[PDB]
Amino acid sequence: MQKDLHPKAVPCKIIYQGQVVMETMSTRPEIHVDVWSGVHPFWTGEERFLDTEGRVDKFNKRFGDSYRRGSKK
Amino acid sequence: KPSEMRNLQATDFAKEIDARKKELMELRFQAAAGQLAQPHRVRQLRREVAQLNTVKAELARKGEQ
Amino acid sequence: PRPSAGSHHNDKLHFKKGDTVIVLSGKHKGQTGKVLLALPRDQKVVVEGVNVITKNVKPSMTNPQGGQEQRELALHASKVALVDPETGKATRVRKQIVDGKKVRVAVASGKTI
Amino acid sequence: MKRTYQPNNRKRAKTHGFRARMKTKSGRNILARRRAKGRHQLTVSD
Amino acid sequence: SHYDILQAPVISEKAYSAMERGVYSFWVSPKATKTEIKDAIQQAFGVRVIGISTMNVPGKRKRVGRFIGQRNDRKKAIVRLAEGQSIEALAGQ
RNA sequence: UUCUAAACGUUGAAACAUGAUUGCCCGUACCGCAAACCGACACAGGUGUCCGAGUGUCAAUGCACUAAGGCGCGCGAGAGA
RNA sequence: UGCCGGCAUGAGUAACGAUAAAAGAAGUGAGAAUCUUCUUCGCCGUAAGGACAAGGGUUCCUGGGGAAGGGUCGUCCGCCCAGGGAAAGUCGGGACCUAAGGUGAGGCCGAACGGCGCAGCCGAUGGACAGCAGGUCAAGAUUCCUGCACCGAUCAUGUGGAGUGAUGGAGGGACGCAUUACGCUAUCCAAUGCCAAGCUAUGGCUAUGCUGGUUGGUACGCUCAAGGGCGAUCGGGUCAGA
RNA sequence: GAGCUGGAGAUACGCUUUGACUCGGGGAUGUCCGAAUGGGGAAACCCACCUCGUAAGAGGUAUCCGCAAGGAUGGGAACUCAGGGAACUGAAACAUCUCAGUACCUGAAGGAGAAGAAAGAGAAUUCGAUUCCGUUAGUAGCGGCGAGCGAACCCGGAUCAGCCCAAAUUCAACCCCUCAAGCCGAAGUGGCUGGAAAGCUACACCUCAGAAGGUGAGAGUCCUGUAGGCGAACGAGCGGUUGACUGUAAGGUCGUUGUUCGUGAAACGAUGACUGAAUCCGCGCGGACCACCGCGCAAGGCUAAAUACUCCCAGUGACCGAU
Numbered sequence A: 001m002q003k004d005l006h007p008k009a010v011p012c013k014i015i016y017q018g019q020v021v022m023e024t025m026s027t028r029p030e031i032h033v034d035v036w037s038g039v040h041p042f043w044t045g046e047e048r049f050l051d052t053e054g055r056v057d058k059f060n061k062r063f064g065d066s067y068r069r070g071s072k073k
Numbered sequence B: 001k002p003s004e005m006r007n008l009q010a011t012d013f014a015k016e017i018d019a020r021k022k023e024l025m026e027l028r029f030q031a032a033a034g035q036l037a038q039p040h041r042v043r044q045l046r047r048e049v050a051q052l053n054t055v056k057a058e059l060a061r062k063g064e065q
Numbered sequence C: 001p002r003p004s005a006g007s008h009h010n011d012k013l014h015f016k017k018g019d020t021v022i023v024l025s026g027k028h029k030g031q032t033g034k035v036l037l038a039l040p041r042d043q044k045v046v047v048e049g050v051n052v053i054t055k056n057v058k059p060s061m062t063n064p065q066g067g068q069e070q071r072e073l074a075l076h077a078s079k080v081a082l083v084d085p086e087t088g089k090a091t092r093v094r095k096q097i098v099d100g101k102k103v104r105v106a107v108a109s110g111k112t113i
Numbered sequence D: 001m002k003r004t005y006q007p008n009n010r011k012r013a014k015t016h017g018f019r020a021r022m023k024t025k026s027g028r029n030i031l032a033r034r035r036a037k038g039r040h041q042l043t044v045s046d
Numbered sequence E: 001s002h003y004d005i006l007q008a009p010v011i012s013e014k015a016y017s018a019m020e021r022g023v024y025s026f027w028v029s030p031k032a033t034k035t036e037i038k039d040a041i042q043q044a045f046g047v048r049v050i051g052i053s054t055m056n057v058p059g060k061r062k063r064v065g066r067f068i069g070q071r072n073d074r075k076k077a078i079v080r081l082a083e084g085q086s087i088e089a090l091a092g093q
Numbered sequence F: 001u002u003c004u005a006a007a008c009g010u011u012g013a014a015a016c017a018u019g020a021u022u023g024c025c026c027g028u029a030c031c032g033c034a035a036a037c038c039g040a041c042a043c044a045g046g047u048g049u050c051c052g053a054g055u056g057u058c059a060a061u062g063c064a065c066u067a068a069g070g071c072g073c074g075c076g077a078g079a080g081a
Numbered sequence G: 001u002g003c004c005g006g007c008a009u010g011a012g013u014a015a016c017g018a019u020a021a022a023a024g025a026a027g028u029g030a031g032a033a034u035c036u037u038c039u040u041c042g043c044c045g046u047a048a049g050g051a052c053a054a055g056g057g058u059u060c061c062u063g064g065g066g067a068a069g070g071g072u073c074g075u076c077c078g079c080c081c082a083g084g085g086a087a088a089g090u091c092g093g094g095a096c097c098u099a100a101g102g103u104g105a106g107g108c109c110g111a112a113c114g115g116c117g118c119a120g121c122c123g124a125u126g127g128a129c130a131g132c133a134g135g136u137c138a139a140g141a142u143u144c145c146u147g148c149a150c151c152g153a154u155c156a157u158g159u160g161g162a163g164u165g166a167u168g169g170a171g172g173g174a175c176g177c178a179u180u181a182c183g184c185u186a187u188c189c190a191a192u193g194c195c196a197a198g199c200u201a202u203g204g205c206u207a208u209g210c211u212g213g214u215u216g217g218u219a220c221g222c223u224c225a226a227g228g229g230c231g232a233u234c235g236g237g238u239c240a241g242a
Numbered sequence H: 001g002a003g004c005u006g007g008a009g010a011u012a013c014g015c016u017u018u019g020a021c022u023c024g025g026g027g028a029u030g031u032c033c034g035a036a037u038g039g040g041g042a043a044a045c046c047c048a049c050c051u052c053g054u055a056a057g058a059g060g061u062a063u064c065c066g067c068a069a070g071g072a073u074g075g076g077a078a079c080u081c082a083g084g085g086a087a088c089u090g091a092a093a094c095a096u097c098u099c100a101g102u103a104c105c106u107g108a109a110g111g112a113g114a115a116g117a118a119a120g121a122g123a124a125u126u127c128g129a130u131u132c133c134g135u136u137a138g139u140a141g142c143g144g145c146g147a148g149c150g151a152a153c154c155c156g157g158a159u160c161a162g163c164c165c166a167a168a169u170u171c172a173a174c175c176c177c178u179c180a181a182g183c184c185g186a187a188g189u190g191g192c193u194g195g196a197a198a199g200c201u202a203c204a205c206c207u208c209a210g211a212a213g214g215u216g217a218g219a220g221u222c223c224u225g226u227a228g229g230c231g232a233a234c235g236a237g238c239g240g241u242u243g244a245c246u247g248u249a250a251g252g253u254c255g256u257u258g259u260u261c262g263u264g265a266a267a268c269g270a271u272g273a274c275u276g277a278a279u280c281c282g283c284g285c286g287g288a289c290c291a292c293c294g295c296g297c298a299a300g301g302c303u304a305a306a307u308a309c310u311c312c313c314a315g316u317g318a319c320c321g322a323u
Helices: B013-018 D025-031
Strands: none
Touching: none
16 A cells, blocks of 8 residues: 555565585585575655656666656656 | 325325324223224224325335436 | 144135035044135134034123034045045036135036036 | 443444454455354344 | 324323423434424324323333343423313323 | 634624523432352342531541431241250 | 262251341231331431432332242232323534544555554544523423523614625633732521410420521622723835745 | 234234235334444434524534546355464474464455466477376475475366457347245044054055145044146346347566475576676576577467365255263
């Protein structure tokens, strides 16, 4: 709700569960971790169909400078 | 009554309610109303303008469209 | 409720107002069934069959007397119906004259009233 | 002295009283967690 | 309308015992206020009303041993009536 | 009762005296620091608000008793090892 | 050593509840000790009074019957049964303002749910009466009878003869603690002040020995302001209370 | 159908045989709350402000998207995913793990959405559109190398059907055809112990229709079903020729999730910052790479049919029996 980025976003997956110094060599490792996270982009923008305020993204402005909807600022 | 206003729009029945439904409420009372008389001549003529205000908002809807 | 009726007889027996019949099923066999109104949807019927005895009190109302005639019991139809004669041949057949309200013609040995 | 509750239920109106599960959308299903979810009537109007 | 509020008496023993000067007690509708209950009792019956009252009185029908059975709310409208409309016979004693 | 802009405003808009006129539905009855409201029940539990006669007594709401008022409380007698 | 349903036995003993006295005449009838008409007793009476606060919702009544309940029971209940009883322009909600906090389209951000917040509504006990005492049945009262206050109110005439519309800054309603008295009656107390219903073999007195009973706001006065703060016609805010 | 409106079946009151009494379908008075939303906002309750108007009172007030109206958001018992994410247990305890992506949260629409026509599976030098179960393979692998999870190679049917971003659908006549009120539906009786016995006995009739059942003792000749077939006004419902429309514009490295693969002796979904090359006999991989073959080509979706579901309407089962 004017929270997540208008584009496509990242959240709703992503966990961890890595080890601690041991990657197949001398002694079979334990485990030690098994938890949650998530990712989000950034700001800066102008206009596209349906104005409200602005959230945009990161990897959504770089080449995101063609598929407009009516702007020229 | 009867079904005579199936062909009469001109506000005459406008005060038709004032007829029997004026002092039959004075016969709808307790005692000296009708226990052994003709008890039925109350809400047996109280649908006198009810179920008759149908096709009155589905017929009388004749305004101009 | 006082389970009597005999409403487990199923409402399709045709009977109405005004008719002359006999009886069976026992108890009497000497009783010309007749007149009556019947009660579709749960039916009461006694005719002069069973001579009850059921004294009502005698308050200060109007009754003061008792009686000993005309009163409820049980036993619906299923005795001896139809046939001006007495037995054999059904009757539920009806002229192609509509008027189900009182269609009149019965079976071969039937009557039209 | 003070019991553990006592009368006056304002926080069972505009919070947890009939129509107060919209303020908390995922409470609407909670409101609907004993009506459109399983048998039984409700618990706010006896 | 001019009549579609007026509805029934009140019948009491201390009515025309305490309700003789002219005052009655009516039997209105759940609709309180007062900008209807009056001109109802104002027409071809030669009786005029003013000084209306309106009160309340609930119901209470706790009958079965358990508790299943109750209310009816309902109201009434006392009024007043000064010198100007006595009786000349009608339907009330 | 403290102050007005567009506009409103010159013969009428409002503040004045007066006859006339108004505050709508709900409670306004019961016990109420109360065996009847919460303690599994009419169990010797329970906290707010207003008055609060009296002589006597430094004051005294401690302390005796009558108002008004509440009242013998969910019992009764004997013999009372 | 289960679970419910019923019968159990602890057994007829312990116990009837705070040990804060009661007898009786008489109503009634089914007999009456705890009802009722009542003279005597005593416990509380800053109470175990009456009203307001929460509550129970059917308490209160016209009363009515034991199946059962009030841990005796009973002709008492607020058990159970129909009806009756809390009459509004000013005591009560809102609309006129508000601290915790909740919420608030846009928005500040969050994986969604959402958290929160600008213009806001709420949320309170809260700022807001301009009548007091009498006449009231079965129960209700400042709404019902009487002398009585009107805040702004519904129209129109008569000094005004011309003013006025927003969130307001005002003066101020915006009060912390404690002391001292410089004020005060209802209410209370001095009763023979006013008028007396009248007095007891008690012994004793009939008279300065004696039961009891007698004001209220609307109103306003060098016989109500006891007591606390100086008032007005000329010029300007060397630039904002948008 | 002609009679009486559900349990305190309610006595009464009242209406009949060209429509009282029950009703089939297309509509309507529709109170406070539900999205309900004038405001208050603790379901049954208090306010402004404009249209109306015999002095009273009648027409209504809330956000989002083509924006200037309007259209939509409500509550849902099991069907797909997605944001979604632990966990007691086991390994005889015991962080990789099994549960798994499971409990729960949140978003969507139809009662169908979900994969489903492609830079493809296979492997003799074959085969096309997803899924399910049938058989394999319970194989290969995985793996504190531990319990354990577990495809592809050969198989069945429902189905073995076309096209999408820059060079069909909408009202209707007719309809095989469904939906409740409803229409008829068969064919003999006497006597006893006794409640009329369908038990003892006696004979005919009914037959494509002889399942449950009510009327005091199990009845085909008392009756409702079953075989034979019908029903309009309203509409859907599976529709058949056609009228008002026009049916052909990214690989990769490092850190990792999945997949059977706990990740390492392996390409393949994709992300955290970096590379937008190839650009056609060029390009994607056969489980890293060399050599040769095999097939498919940036680029966006539709695909009904079965697989998996179970609110309702007939009918159906070697169950219970009203703790």
